[PDB]
Structure formats: C-alpha cells, structure tokens
C-alpha cells in the first residue's frame, strides 16, 4: 500500500479506458470530420496520463522502491517494442521512458499519419462528389478536363508540406526511411524539406489521374465515346480504392500500435498490482 503505486494504478486504468474508446473511433467505415476530432481528444488524454504515470514512475525510481522477482517475471510479456538482473531504480526509469517513447515516437506517429492521410482523402472525396458537375452526357459524355485537373493539382498542392511523418520539423534520412518502410513506400515518399527529410504523402494515385486526363486530349472540355468514358472512370475509380485502401492500411497500423501500447499498460498495471 503506497500512494504512488495507487495513483499509478488508477492512471493506467484510465489509459486502458481511453484505449478502448479510441478503438471504437478507429473501427468505422467513415472517418468523418468528427472522427479525427475524437481521435485527438483521446490522444491528448493518453499523452497527459502517460506524463502523470512517468512522474509517478520517477518517484518510484529515485526512492528505489523494490520490484519483487515475482513481478519482474511479468515484464517479459511486455511487447518487444517496449525494449524491456538490473537495479530497482534503473528499471522504473526503463519503464517511464519506455511508456513515454511508445507514445511520442511510436503511437503518436501512426496517429498523425492517419490524420494527414484522412484529411487528404477527405478533400479528395470532395472532388469525387463534385464529379457530377464536370461530366455531362448527351453515347456521348462531355468532360470538363481543365476544371478537374485544376482540382486535383490543387489537392497535391494543398498537402505537399503536410507529411505523414514527422508532425513538426524534420528527421534524418535513416529515420525517414525507417518509417517509410513501416508505413509503406506506396502510401508515403521521403522528401527533402529545408535541411532534413520527411515522409510526405504519396500522391501517385492523383498523378496517375492527371496523366490519364492529359491522354484524353482536347483543349479544355473533351467529349468521350461511351467506351472511352467507362475506361477513364474505371481507372479513376480504381485510384480511389487505392487511396481508400492506403488509408485502411494506416488505420490498422494505428489500431495495432494501440493494441501494443495497451498491452504494455496491461502488463504494467498487473506488475504494480502485485508489487
């Protein structure tokens, strides 16, 4: 019975409470405008509760509170991402930083990638809804190619300096590349920003659209045969699924990174409930 362990126990259970609430927001076909808003609240609550836990874990380290051998056996179940015969104080510190780096440099990375790509695909879906106003039938089908390319080109522009990672500032090539491999070379692309690098959104799906439109020819508005229209729309709809699957990929990488962080808490919570 120690106040620091009790306050830690309760803070960790409040984390597992937020983790579950975030798993709900992440399992929905549509990540609406509100979905990102909810994801932000839970993330900010996790961040400040992890900060409180660290401050509590710090107390336990400097005071060298014992971690019984019956409890050190449970820290083996901690995910290998946590990086867990060492001193009592060194192990409490080896946790406060573990739980803190699992959030800043691991969990929150997937969070921003999701939001960055969610915003991008949200704005693209607006181009999708506005296609009704750029396609007129007469078979015959008139297409406002210029208006559509301008829309897609300004989508690329609006997100050139909004990378999947990092959220702020830059990182090293070996750091941008190491995260590119985890997210996917098809969803992102390392890019130079000022002196360092980032993991920018990969806009190849939109680039492919612009190439297909340039191939339709014409000098502005283009009238297609019925077969030439179903052909274009098929490739334009296939690129839509590519981005929709790219986003589903990030969501799973995020919810899985949450399940890991959650088990790092489940293990920790059971490690203090004993000691």
């Amino acid at each position: 019975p120690v106040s620091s362990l009790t306050m830690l126990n309760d803070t960790l259970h409040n984390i597992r409470t937020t983790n579950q609430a975030l798993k709900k927001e992440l399992s929905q076909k549509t990540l609406t405008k509100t979905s990102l808003e909810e994801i932000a609240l839970h993330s900010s609550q996790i961040s400040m509760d992890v900060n409180k836990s660290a401050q509590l874990l710090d107390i336990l380290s400097r005071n060298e509170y014992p971690i019984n051998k019956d409890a050190r056996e449970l820290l083996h179940s901690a995910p290998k991402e946590a990086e867990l015969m060492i001193s009592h104080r060194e192990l409490w510190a080896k946790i406060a930083n573990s739980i803190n780096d699992i959030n800043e440099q691991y969990l929150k990375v997937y969070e921003h990638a999701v939001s960055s790509y969610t915003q991008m695909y949200q704005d693209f879906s607006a181009v999708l809804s506005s296609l009704a106003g750029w396609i007129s039938p007469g078979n015959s089908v008139k297409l406002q190619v210029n208006s559509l390319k301008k829309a897609l080109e300004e989508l690329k522009e609006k997100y050139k300096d909004k990378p999947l990672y990092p959220a702020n500032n830059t990182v090293s090539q070996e750091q941008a590349n190491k995260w590119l491999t985890e997210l996917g070379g098809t969803i992102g692309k390392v890019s130079q920003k000022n002196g360092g690098y980032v993991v920018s959104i990969n806009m190849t799906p939109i680039d492919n659209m612009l190439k297909s439109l340039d191939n339709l020819g014409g000098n502005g508005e283009v009238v297609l045969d019925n077969a030439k229209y179903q052909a274009w729309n098929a490739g334009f709809s296939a690129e839509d699924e590519t981005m929709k699957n790219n986003l589903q990929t990030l969501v799973q990488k995020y919810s899985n990174a949450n399940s890991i962080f959650d088990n790092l808490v489940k293990v920790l919570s059971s490690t203090i409930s004993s000691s």
Partner: nanobody
Amino acid sequence: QVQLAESGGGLVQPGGSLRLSCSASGGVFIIYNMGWYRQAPGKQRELVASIDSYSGSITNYADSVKGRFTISRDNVEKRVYLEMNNLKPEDTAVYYCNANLRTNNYWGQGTQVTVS
C-alpha cells in the same frame, strides 16, 4: 474568374435567425477557401467565419460568434452557407462572402443584415 452573389439578408429581431447563402459561378469552386466577412457602419471590416477548400473540415469563427453561426459549403451545387442563430444587434452589418486561394480573391456584393 469566379462570380459570387450573396442572398438571405434582411431585418430580424434580436434572437432571430437567418440562413445566409452565397452562390458561386465560374472557376473551380472546390479549390478556394471560403470566408464570410461583415462590416458594420463606421466600424472596420471583420472576419466572422472561414472554411477551407475541398471537404471543408477546418473551420474557425470569431469569439463574438462561436456557438451561434455555422459555416458550410456545398461543392456539388457550389454554394457557401452561413446559418446565423440567436442574432444580436451588434451582428448588424453587410455580410460579404470571400473566395480565396493564395493571391486569388473574389467577392460578392453582400447582403444587409439588420437586427433590432
């Protein structure tokens, strides 16, 4: 070039509400960030609501307006809306609608909104 035209103004009593509407015609409506402005007699122009291009997820309002106005956009029909609830006398002004993207800016003539 984009042509803007606002409609829906008029006289209301304090606590009343309006449905301000701006219809656009011309360029690519979807790429422009929209924003409603107002200028009361004598006083200086003011930004009241703003919405970004495309889906329009990002919106912020002036402190004197939050919770009462709401800005939305219809890319399909190419119109910008500003529903105004619980209107106060200080909300009296000519409300203009702005389409903006980098240095590109387009304006409608604006509607009068009087609350008394």
